[PDB]
Structure 1
Amino acid sequence: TIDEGLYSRQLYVLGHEAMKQMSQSNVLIIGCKGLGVEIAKNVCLAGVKSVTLYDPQPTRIEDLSSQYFLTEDDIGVPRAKVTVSKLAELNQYVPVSVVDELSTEYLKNFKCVVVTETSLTKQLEINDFTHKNHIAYIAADSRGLFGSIFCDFGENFICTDTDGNEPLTGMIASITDDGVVTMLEETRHGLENGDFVKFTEVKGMPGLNDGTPRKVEVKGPYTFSIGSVKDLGSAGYNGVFTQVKVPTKISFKSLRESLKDPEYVYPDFGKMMRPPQYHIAFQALSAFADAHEGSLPRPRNDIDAAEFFEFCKKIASTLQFDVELDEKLIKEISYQARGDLVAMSAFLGGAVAQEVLKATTSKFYPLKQYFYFDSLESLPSSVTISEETCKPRGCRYDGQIAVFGSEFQEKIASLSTFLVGAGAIGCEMLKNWAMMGVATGESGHISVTDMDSIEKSNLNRQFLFRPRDVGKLKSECASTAVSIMNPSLTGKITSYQERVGPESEGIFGDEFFEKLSLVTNALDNVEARMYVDRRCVFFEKPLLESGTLGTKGNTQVVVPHLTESYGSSQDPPEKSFPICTLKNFPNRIEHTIAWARDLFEGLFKQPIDNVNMYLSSPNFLETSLKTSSNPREVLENIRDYLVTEKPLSFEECIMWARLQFDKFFNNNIQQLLFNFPKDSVTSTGQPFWSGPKRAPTPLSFDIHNREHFDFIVAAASLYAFNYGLKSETDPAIYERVLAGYNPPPFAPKSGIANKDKQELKSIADSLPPPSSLVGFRLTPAEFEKDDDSNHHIDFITAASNLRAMNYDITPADRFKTKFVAGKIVPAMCTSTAVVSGLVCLELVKLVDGKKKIEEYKNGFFNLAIGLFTFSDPIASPKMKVNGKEIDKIWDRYNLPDCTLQELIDYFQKEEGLEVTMLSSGVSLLYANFQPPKKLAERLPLKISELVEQITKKKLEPFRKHLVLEICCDDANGEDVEVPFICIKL
């Protein structure tokens, strides 16, 4: 009963069973500050049974530093009471409540308990109970630029999936008598020692088809071992193996036990001596708070720092921690005790929400047990940070001023950012910017662009949108929501509905870009990312890239003249199957799905386009007769869809669907088996239908079968949609019409001048004239995966399953078909929160203008295994040109709009280089090997005039520069790379 219309992207990460088990768990959250509200938001979007909040403390102004559900009108009201109303709106399937008081026994009502902003004594009291009653307990804390997470799921936690990867499967070539299993040619099994596999469709060793898992002993990238199969048989041929995943048992320790002997999780291996320091530091913080009526050390106060260090020494002595305390780091923790940053809150909230999901669903490997994190490299160094600057000013930014100071707040308030995209990452970035006060000054500004509209499936991870906003533009809704969150951003945000690409350069031109301070990408495709990267490289603006995929995520920073651009790195491309495999010899469900998609396009999209173009373009036939690769195909499509097979009712559509079923699932298979019989052999004597090639069998139409009826219904409905007829769904009409159908005879054909053009002309003149059909058009079918009433996915699923039945492939359901055909990218709210937090932690580094490349960090993480890693950016490559140091990426030549001859002479006389090729855009302006006449005609022209002449298109009035790529040779004839040229028009 999972609403797949809302959890479409999340189910591809978790699954149906995981979410079903998740919808029966109760989550209690203690503490409703920024971290608590972030955790509650992520949990509510996740889809747990219900959420309960407990925070009776009255609101204070500083709490607004990271609480985006609190407004200045709520000062003096308990945080939970004012937050429940806004949290209840995020998801309609997840009720949210509030409890005024907590009793120990009451804790038995909840599956998971999350604790934040609670003293250590209360945490011990809660854990001593929740541990022995088998209740998952998570404790999170955020102090300035430091964070801590602790997990305790009981002594006998059962983890079904430990890595989140799909079971490994592959095709076997031969299995010896000693269990040596070998993969097909150029095929890697990918198994690891100790894994369990099950075999099916094994020839020669039926005993392995039972399904009992067997141990795996990897012997190489192409072969492994399973043990002794002596009894079962001597040698097995072919077959498919599939990995089996066994549950694991994880034993946690209670908080009281784990204080003495903790088990750390290291987010980075460059600093492995810190977590022991933070373990003492946080306990010292708790003791100090207990000793001062719950008052944390004041910001950048020396006396409080000394007292905190004395507490740290006492704790270290008490716990027999044989570790020398680092005074600098501990006192830094003391200084930032009262800090409250929205970026750290978002990061820890995403992590803790993922831990809650792990606890509820018994999936993925959880943290075990202490996770201490710090982003201390983000502390500004170009401004004055002291007690005077960091003291509170009685404003909503106190939580951030306590870490960065007032001068850095002024620096942030005057930013002019440019956000590309308004998806999940875009929404999180806008929330973080609004909380941080970005562009709230006189000179500040924000620009957000996105051309897409809100859809139902987007509401699962884009919390700024509501069901009432479905169908509206993302940018406007996001801007309005963030303006509501922070009133100071009224009038400081601009929203565009423009796609960032070559066609939008009239809006995002030189004037628009010259005023920016940084660009943040929230895109989902590589083309736009590359384009924006090129624009930033040309204009020399900092860029922040971030990407997510399921539970994996990464963040990268591009700094002018310091690091390399986004395009300097290559990512694995999409896998496209050979045309021969798809056309005739499929062996996986993906091949059949691709074939079904091609069939859909060729049946309901291309012929309609040809018919429409014929009725519109007066000279379409002549152009097609010598331009298209198959004019006969176009003419046949036009004839069939206009006169020969034009339906007059829905019964004719049903008959056409039956005919197409016969055409594509019964006759082509017969022809293929006529060309290559099942007993045929290759040129080497081996059987033809062996290994990757599976022998097909024609299908006979059975109306009672479900798949056949589904295909008929979908095809008839789509044909009626094409011709605008009234479709029907009652099986009675289908069964009545298809009963009286006589299949035309079909016998495979063995085969065995210029008159063809005459036949083509005869067909062409047989078509009705365009003038006779004015105002008549056929509606093409544009593929749309997200709609379940257009029969697109239904048709694709039916066709794919029928072709799988042809080749004895295991059919898939509509869920997997939608996942594969639609190129759906799995997405999660927790991953989005984490990447937004990391990007906003890099943003403060960018604002401070840090120069060293070791101070920036590109981040990668995988939440299914609890892996976090950070590495320095790669420096931009250097080069030697004319005995000078040149940056390959961030350097360019600035020249006037001189003539081509003058440009060549300048490059010859100044750089001592001979120009051999000069191009602009996608046109070859000049090449050394061109005939002399062409050059003599082109040499004395200006660059702008040359570009206009060659590209046959006048330059736009808003164009102010030209980017030219030049390849030149040195005096000796050796090729030397040079930076591009920036011609100023």
Structure 2
Amino acid sequence: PRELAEAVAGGRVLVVGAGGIGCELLKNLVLTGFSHIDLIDLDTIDVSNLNRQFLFQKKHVGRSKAQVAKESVLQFYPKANIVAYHDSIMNPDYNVEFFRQFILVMNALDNRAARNHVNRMCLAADVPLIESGTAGYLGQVTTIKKGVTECYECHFPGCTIRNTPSEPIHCIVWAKYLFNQLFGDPVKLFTKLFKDDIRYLLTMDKLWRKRKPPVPLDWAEVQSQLGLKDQQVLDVKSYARLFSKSIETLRVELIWDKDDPSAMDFVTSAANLRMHIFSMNMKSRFDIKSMAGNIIPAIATTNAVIAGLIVLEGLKILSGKIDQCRTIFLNKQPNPRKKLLVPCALDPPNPNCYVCASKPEVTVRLTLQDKIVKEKFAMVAPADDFLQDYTLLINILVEFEVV
């Protein structure tokens, strides 16, 4: 209709993220007639993106997502106007004024922290926000509107790790801590960690009354012993060797990245030795990659469905039909009423929201700046955050805890 079409032709929209959801969404907005789009993504293209981020081909690996996405779209519709940022949305330059330019913001993000930031920015700028998320076969869409709707935020112990691990993940988390401790001579580290420390650990006699004791490993002793390559579980000797090999490659502040072969090999080997020591079956590098990297399994069709819904919701917003917007869940199997997609009316702001309520306050019983104000309460440039135009009053009453 003439009114919607002119809004779609006139206004400027922001897409935060050029991945699974974002590629699909960028295409859908263009084809729907959205004539002014800003696209931001901080990342470059990886080979594993190519099953579902359809604007990127193999030759593009290593380039910026947002820039390639624009180049790809312009090849099928040159008169698209798109501005691409190879940047993070949490950059203070994307301030309330920047956000104020857009008649609609759409998230295409993969983590809660970034969404929390965009939520505040959109509240502050008083621009509607379509929020969305996927994982495997599942996903959802909703509309966030200040004054009208709920906002996005309206709703292992060291001892298990260091002393009494009982599951593969504890060894994996341990291997990650170990990587940071060292990087965040192989034979000497190997014996210290896998022989000595497990002896020092057999000193604490109380612990091993109940559960099965660890068995120390000696370097020289160990040296004397269908599916994809990575899905194979190797023997102890192999991991011991890998551990060595990876330390070699690593020495030649680092942040752990699942995609760095050496760092990944490190954590795999370490965790597998630790697993062997505590009488657990060792795990394939494929499996350890999942668990250590927190890999979300992901495909084309789910993101494509969700990105289609996003635009339909945007059209309702821009047609002044927000009452007609919904939260839509994408199921794998139909509910009892045969609904594969489950729409629900939007909920009003929660009066006791720590974020979007009139004068928010909370009670907590450099650790404050980082692990509370920044981490727990998602502030970025901090209790004020003039970027997020948000003030939170903290009442001071397991390090800390929120009542």
The 3 A distance-change label for structure 1 pair 549 and 699 is same
Deviation of residue 461 (structure 1)?
0.7
How high is the sequence identity, in percent, across the aligned residues?
Answer: 32
> Which secondary structure state, in structure 1, belongs to the residue aligned with residue 102 of structure 2?
coil
Deviation of residue 414 (structure 1)?
1.5
In structure 2, give the amino acid aligned to 1:833: A
Deviation of residue 851 (structure 1)?
5.0
Does 1:826 pair with 2:306? no
Alignment counterpart, residue 31 of structure 2, candidates 435, 447, 451: 435
Q: In the alignment, which residue of structure 2 is the partner of 1:493?
A: 82
Deviation of residue 512 (structure 1)?
2.4
Alignment counterpart, residue 578 of structure 1, candidates 157, 168, 173: 157
Alignment counterpart, residue 325 of structure 2, candidates 856, 862, 869: 856
Mapping 1:314-713, distance limit 5 Å: 405-439=1-35, 445-489=36-80, 492-501=81-90, 504-506=91-93, 508-569=94-155, 577-603=156-182, 605-606=183-184, 656-676=185-205, 688-690=208-210, 693-700=211-218, 701-705=221-225, 707-713=235-241
Contact 2:326/2:343 (8 A) holds in 1: yes
TM-score (norm: length of structure 2) = 0.80
> Which secondary structure state, in structure 1, belongs to the residue aligned with residue 222 of structure 2?
coil
Contact 2:131/2:143 (8 A) holds in 1: yes
The 3 A distance-change label for structure 1 pair 807 and 865 is farther
Rounded to whole Å, the distance in 1 between the matches of 2:310 and 2:190 is 53
**Cα-to-partner distance string for 1:247-301 (whole Å, 9 max, x where unaligned):** xxxxxxxxxxxxxxxxxxxxxxxxxxxxxxxxxxxxxxxxxxxxxxxxxxxxxxx
The 3 A distance-change label for structure 1 pair 707 and 782 is farther
Mapping 1:174-253, distance limit 5 Å: none
Rounded to whole Å, the distance in 2 between the matches of 1:517 and 1:593 is 45
In structure 1, give the amino acid aligned to 2:78: P
The 3 A distance-change label for structure 1 pair 966 and 593 is closer
Does 1:870 pair with 2:359? no
The 3 A distance-change label for structure 1 pair 723 and 567 is closer
**Cα-to-partner distance string for 1:213-249 (whole Å, 9 max, x where unaligned):** xxxxxxxxxxxxxxxxxxxxxxxxxxxxxxxxxxxxx
In structure 2, give the amino acid aligned to 1:849: G
> Which secondary structure state, in structure 1, belongs to the residue aligned with residue 303 of structure 2?
helix
The 3 A distance-change label for structure 1 pair 872 and 961 is closer
In structure 2, give the amino acid aligned to 1:662: T
Q: In the alignment, which residue of structure 1 is the partner of 2:244?
A: 716
Rounded to whole Å, the distance in 2 between the matches of 1:461 and 1:408 is 30
> Which secondary structure state, in structure 2, belongs to the residue aligned with residue 488 of structure 1?
coil
In structure 2, give the amino acid aligned to 1:823: N
TM-score (norm: length of structure 1) = 0.34
**Cα-to-partner distance string for 1:338-392 (whole Å, 9 max, x where unaligned):** xxxxxxxxxxxxxxxxxxxxxxxxxxxxxxxxxxxxxxxxxxxxxxxxxxxxxxx
Contact 1:561/1:890 (8 A) holds in 2: no
Deviation of residue 960 (structure 1)?
9.9
Rounded to whole Å, the distance in 2 between the matches of 1:674 and 1:877 is 53
Rounded to whole Å, the distance in 2 between the matches of 1:717 and 1:458 is 28
In structure 2, give the amino acid aligned to 1:410: E
**Cα-to-partner distance string for 1:50-89 (whole Å, 9 max, x where unaligned):** xxxxxxxxxxxxxxxxxxxxxxxxxxxxxxxxxxxxxxxx
The 3 A distance-change label for structure 1 pair 496 and 446 is same
Deviation of residue 522 (structure 1)?
0.6
Deviation of residue 427 (structure 1)?
0.5
In structure 1, give the amino acid aligned to 2:256: F
Alignment counterpart, residue 786 of structure 1, candidates 228, 234, 259: 259
Rounded to whole Å, the distance in 2 between the matches of 1:961 and 1:452 is 23
Q: In the alignment, which residue of structure 2 is the partner of 1:843?
A: 314
Rounded to whole Å, the distance in 2 between the matches of 1:786 and 1:513 is 33
Contact 2:223/2:237 (8 A) holds in 1: yes
Rounded to whole Å, the distance in 1 between the matches of 2:290 and 2:115 is 24
The 3 A distance-change label for structure 1 pair 872 and 599 is same
The 3 A distance-change label for structure 1 pair 713 and 817 is same
Gaps of 5+ in 1: 1-404, 440-444, 570-576, 607-655, 683-687, 725-779, 880-887, 893-921, 924-950, 969-985
Rounded to whole Å, the distance in 2 between the matches of 1:808 and 1:878 is 52
Rounded to whole Å, the distance in 2 between the matches of 1:561 and 1:832 is 29
Q: Highest Rg: 1 or 2?
A: 1
Q: Out of 522-531 and 560-569, give the one that drifted further.
A: 560-569
The 3 A distance-change label for structure 1 pair 511 and 698 is closer
Rounded to whole Å, the distance in 1 between the matches of 2:51 and 2:280 is 34
> Which secondary structure state, in structure 1, belongs to the residue aligned with residue 280 of structure 2?
coil
In structure 2, give the amino acid aligned to 1:552: L
The 3 A distance-change label for structure 1 pair 807 and 511 is closer
Contact 1:801/1:812 (8 A) holds in 2: yes
The 3 A distance-change label for structure 1 pair 783 and 822 is same
Deviation of residue 961 (structure 1)?
10
Rounded to whole Å, the distance in 2 between the matches of 1:831 and 1:868 is 12
Rounded to whole Å, the distance in 2 between the matches of 1:809 and 1:878 is 49
Contact 1:710/1:795 (8 A) holds in 2: no
Q: In the alignment, which residue of structure 1 is the partner of 2:362?
A: none
Rounded to whole Å, the distance in 2 between the matches of 1:668 and 1:960 is 47
